[PDB]
Amino acid sequence: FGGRRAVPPNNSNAAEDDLPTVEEFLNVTSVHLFKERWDTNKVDHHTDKYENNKLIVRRGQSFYVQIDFSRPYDPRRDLFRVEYVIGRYPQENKGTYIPVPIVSELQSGKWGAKIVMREDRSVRLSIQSSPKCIVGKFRMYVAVWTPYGVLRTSRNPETDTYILFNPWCEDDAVYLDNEKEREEYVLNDIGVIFYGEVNDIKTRSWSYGQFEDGILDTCLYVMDRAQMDLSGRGNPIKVSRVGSAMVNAKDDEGVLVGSWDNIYAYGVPPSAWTGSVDILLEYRSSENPVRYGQCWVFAGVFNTFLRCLGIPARIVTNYFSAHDNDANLQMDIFLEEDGNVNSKLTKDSVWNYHCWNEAWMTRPDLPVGFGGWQAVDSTPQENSDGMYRCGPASVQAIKHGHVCFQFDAPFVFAEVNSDLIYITAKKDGTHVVENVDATHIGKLIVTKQIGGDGMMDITDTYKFQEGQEEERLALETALMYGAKKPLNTSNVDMDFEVENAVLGKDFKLSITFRNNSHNRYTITAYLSANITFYTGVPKAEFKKETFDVTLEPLSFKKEAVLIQAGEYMGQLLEQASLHFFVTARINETRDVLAKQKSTVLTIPEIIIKVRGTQVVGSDMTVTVEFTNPLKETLRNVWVHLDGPGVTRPMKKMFREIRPNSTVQWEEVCRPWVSGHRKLIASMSSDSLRHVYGELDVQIQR
Amino acid sequence: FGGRRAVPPNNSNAAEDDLPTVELQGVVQEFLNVTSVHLFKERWDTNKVDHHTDKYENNKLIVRRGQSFYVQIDFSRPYDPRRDLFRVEYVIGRYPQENKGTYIPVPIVSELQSGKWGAKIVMREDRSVRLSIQSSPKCIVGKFRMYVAVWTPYGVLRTSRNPETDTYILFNPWCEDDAVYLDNEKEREEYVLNDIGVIFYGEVNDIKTRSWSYGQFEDGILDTCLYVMDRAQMDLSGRGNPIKVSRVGSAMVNAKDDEGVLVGSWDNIYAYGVPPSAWTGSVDILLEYRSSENPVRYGQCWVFAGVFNTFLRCLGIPARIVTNYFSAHDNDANLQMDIFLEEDGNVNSKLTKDSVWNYHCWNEAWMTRPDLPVGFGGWQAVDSTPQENSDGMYRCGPASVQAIKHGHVCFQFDAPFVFAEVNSDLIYITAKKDGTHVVENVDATHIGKLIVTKQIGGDGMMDITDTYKFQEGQEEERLALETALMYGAKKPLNTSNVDMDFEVENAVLGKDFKLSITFRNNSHNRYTITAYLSANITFYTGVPKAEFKKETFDVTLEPLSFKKEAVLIQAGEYMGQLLEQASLHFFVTARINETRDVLAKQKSTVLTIPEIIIKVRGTQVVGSDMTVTVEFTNPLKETLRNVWVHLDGPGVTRPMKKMFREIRPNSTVQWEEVCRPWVSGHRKLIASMSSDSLRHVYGELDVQIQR
Ligand SMILES: [Ca+2]
Ligand SMILES: [Ca+2]
């Protein structure tokens, strides 16, 4: 017996029922959706880019259709309506079965088709869809009411209509108030990711490829995979919520398998990906998680998902990110009485950088003022529910400390608002808090700018200025709704700068000391440089050195060191990150001075060049060039080319590139998208990876 | 490499590292060696008795957080305050860290401190020292490993792994500084210490009760609750948060695929499991889940609630099961439940697919809510029976019950869904042949009409509907509804002087019964009505299987008057077609000809299934045999196949069952088991019977066990 619910869950846009064709009367002979990509419909609904041959409109906006009948429509003795249905169990009640009534005028916010033209046996309609409509692929019918039952059109796949989110419709939640932001955030399918570190910002390109053939369907499939209730697919919040939860593969469910293990044995290294396109297609193709991804990889894929559906989204990169924060606002560094970092206890690392997504939508479920951008982090960490993605959290609520409001705001708030606490763990077992640094985590938050590949600084959007009461107010409120501060809080200054260097080069480092006091100090400063993964996780202390300083009053003292390429070269991890600690305990006052900086060695680039003709439908030759400036023969050197609208993503491995050898790969491309495009490449050998390169090509036609 | 995190997640209590017995460092030996440790953990002693952990059938020390307990450390030679530094340590998981609260160095201290870990040397006698140890009231809940370490200036020396000193530390409803603190003893006794509950079912005009064995103190249960959290990979540093324990624990009750305690099923057949109706308590279910390490088949709402209540009370979180009569489950935050009518007034059963549950059970867990503004602490509603929430198909809660009452549903967790469970409106709507729809009437008095829970006294019912909602009609309720509507609650549609209602006689399974409809014409107009009656056989969830009786009649209402119409429902009309729980649903809709006005009303009835008989003889004394006698007399005129009888009674017997391949009509079987009670005072024997057909049959017997 089916005793839990009378009608089973309607959670698959792919499944379908069989609507009966029977429940001088007027019977339809043909249906015309003006669905060509040059036509009024797709152009005005901004769905002309999608490599799809079905009508694709946006909710909350009218589109035209033409019904042809057996004989002409006569208002005196005829009743018909268009219907759109979705899922295996459509129900009017649940918005999955939609009868579009014939209306005189179209009413703001309701489904309705108005008879706009009548010629011979044809009726032209202007159909308006509700602005809170379910997003998915709807099946279309025409039903004709007669006095025994209803007559309806037969399953016609050619008329299937996609109704997406509508940033342009001012009555949609997704309503984005500006045409420029809409092109970037919804219509632009090439993105830029910021990596490296706060004082050496790296940039790389990503093919979001949302208009590529098969991506929209994979986006619906991702939802059918989460068995998402069709009745909720029209809520951008729930779509963000359920959708981000599918990015990271929990087991053998989810799009991407996460792994920061530097080898990536049974799959593709995260550094290898050029875009979300092959990933998603691999997912749909295989129906199994795609190995492997990391933060920017999950964020690249999720941004594709959101934009592809019509919710404006962007990727954000925070500098010095307190992930796995557990909503605590203190990251600890343990010092010995000696002034030396205790590496046994000090086990919480800050990420050099951490990307997540931002989704634009209103938040009617919240006090007014909280719409706009909502932070969504597909990279799980412990939240109130367990090991899951976080969000959507209103960036505005996070900025103000109103972290009680869903979803997972205390975690995102702590991701950018934590302090570093320097603590002396004594030889007797006790702990003594030495110093607190309220300016390292979330030092710089960044995302691609609207009119170009540049970087826009968005730090002030997640939080206020350090010191002023606004930041102080946000802090005092957060503390009340989920944020935690478990521990309560000599005239010498220390500081130090490392120097950015090219992979394989030596580099300086300098420590400055300034004693504004009128007494002589003797100190013991210590340097500890570790090889780290981008997450801050340390692998090994490649350089350790002890400094003995003797400051004089009113003195400024600078000391220098040179890290030699050989001290790190056989040990670096992908991304080539290095971390530095300079801790200094004075002697006469037993006080500690501590500082840390990270650095990444600037890594090589791929050379992409073109020749031949650059016109849509026209062959141009593209050459992928890699000059390995290293002293090791590079094994299994996979190279990858992408370029949304110019080429699909492709890969070629070169058995081994020997020292200072350039290898070349030309690929004959035939664009399908005119205008400003971009060629994208990556390279991941068997050791050296996270090597990128791009080429901007102009395609004509 | 594992570049994700420096140290793996500490999310198993069962996992353990090896703490070194000597961890020195530097250069260059009798400093104090522990000879032995004495936790004074006997069940009759003061540690367990004062920590109210003495009922646990567990020979390890079990203590509640935030309250001092005593230990004695016998050294190798007399502690000498002058040179010896030492202290107790508590560690949990494979990756303990002071930071996360999983490695806990308890400092020897001059005076116990409020809400901090410390041990005060309360005695010194020949090598031995006695300590009064106090745990922080925010301590992680679980079973910890105990060590004793001696600080030497070059590293430390410490005890080796000793399973016998493993100490469980639980939530403490008796500690004023514990988030779980409950004021008076009567409540703690009830919501924490009582291991037998009562579940309410049936329908609002016919409340049924049955006993349920929580058995939180029975052998194996504490460890199983720790195992549930381990199977959910629950971060150990979150096991000290009752809000999180409730959130994660409930999510573990319902089995999604092959993770979870119980596979829910509502199909009336139960092919490869035990019918949800057969279970007598949580014990055998939690122990099966632990042995097999796979989901137990099967459960329904009250079963999920029973098992979750055990889980909660076992860890130390006060909890109770609540029953909501006429529950709007699967609401999607909509406060509107639809009934579609045809133009003539009849109910349209193809369009009416939403059903109201005769009743629905969930749990309440008591704790402060520091994450929410003041006033939302106390009972938190948590429902482990899934429904579509903001995240997906999952359990809902904990949701401040005070937030639901005031409609402050923006506050976590899933408050809009629980608010709608109790506040939906039934909307009668006519579906016309031309396809359009017209709204006739909204009945705002059906759903959440009675919310009940067992009394602190004994087995009686406590009406707690007022804790979930204000009185119908007055200001506080309109406001609460106003506030909710702006934070997640949804009403998708906008809303002749004849009244109508009807009563249905409760019958015993197999007997005729009557239904009586009354119409009140409060106007001066004379009307003509055509009323319809549709009686459906249904599941407790309201899902109908078949219309067993339909009747349509014409009435002529005189101005200002009452008019009754009585209907006889003969047994023969429903007998061969009931579903377990024997629910019946009646719709009575009428249509007034002159005005086109619609009158509509609904009622449910459950047929009363006779009890099982339990008898005992002999010595009802702890450690002495008494023979229990359960006998069931087949009420039906049909023969029963594979009749299973279950017997239970925490402290009196472990759950058990025997099968009868067949019980011919009017026959009687008897099962007798010799029980050697291990718990004294007022106990209870509980039984159930479930066969290939008749089922949802229970019984019990109260017993006083002497000492
Ligand atoms: Ca800060
Ligand atoms: Ca009500």
Curated annotation (Swiss-Prot), chain B:
Mutation effect (P153L): In FA13AD; mild; no effect on intracellular protein abundance; no effect on protein-glutamine gamma-glutamyltransferase activity; no effect on alpha-2-antiplasmin to fibrin cross-linking activity; loss of fibrin alpha chain cross-linking activity; decreased clot fiber thickness
Taxonomic source organism: Homo sapiens (Human)
Listed SMART domains: TGc
Catalyzed reactions: L-glutaminyl-[protein] + L-lysyl-[protein] = [protein]-L-lysyl-N(6)-5-L-glutamyl-[protein] + NH4(+)
Implicated disorder: Factor XIII subunit A deficiency: An autosomal recessive hematologic disorder characterized by a life-long bleeding tendency, impaired wound healing and spontaneous abortion in affected women.
Family note: Belongs to the transglutaminase superfamily. Transglutaminase family.
Record text on subunit structure and interactions: Tetramer of two A chains (F13A1) and two B (F13B) chains.
Keywords: Acetylation, Acyltransferase, Blood coagulation, Calcium, Cytoplasm, Disease variant, Glycoprotein, Hemostasis, Metal-binding, Secreted, Transferase, Zymogen
GO term, biological process aspect, one: peptide cross-linking
Active site: C301, H360, D383
GO molecular function, one term: protein-glutamine gamma-glutamyltransferase activity
EC number(s) stated in the UniProt entry for this protein: 2.3.2.13
Major site of localization recorded for this protein: cytoplasm
Role, per record: Factor XIII is activated by thrombin and calcium ion to a transglutaminase that catalyzes the formation of gamma-glutamyl-epsilon-lysine cross-links between fibrin chains, thus stabilizing the fibrin clot. Also cross-link alpha-2-plasmin inhibitor, or fibronectin, to the alpha chains of fibrin.
Keyword ATP-binding: no
Post-translational modification: The activation peptide is released by thrombin.
InterPro entries xrefs: Ig-like_fold, Ig_E-set, Papain-like_cys_pep_sf, Transglutaminase, Transglutaminase-like, Transglutaminase-like_sf, Transglutaminase_animal, Transglutaminase_AS
SUPFAM superfamilies, per database record: Cysteine proteinases, E set domains, Transglutaminase, two C-terminal domains
Effect seen on changing R683Q: In FA13AD; mild; decreased intracellular protein abundance; loss of protein-glutamine gamma-glutamyltransferase activity; decreased alpha-2-antiplasmin to fibrin cross-linking activity; decreased rate of fibrin alpha chain cross-linking activity; decreased clot fiber thickness
Cofactor descriptive note: Binds 1 Ca(2+) ion per subunit.
Phenotype when changing R520Q: In FA13AD; decreased intracellular protein abundance; no effect on protein-glutamine gamma-glutamyltransferase activity; no effect on alpha-2-antiplasmin to fibrin cross-linking activity; no effect on fibrin alpha chain and gamma chain cross-linking activity; decreased clot fiber thickness
Name of the featured protein: Coagulation factor XIII A chain
Glycosylation sites: N593
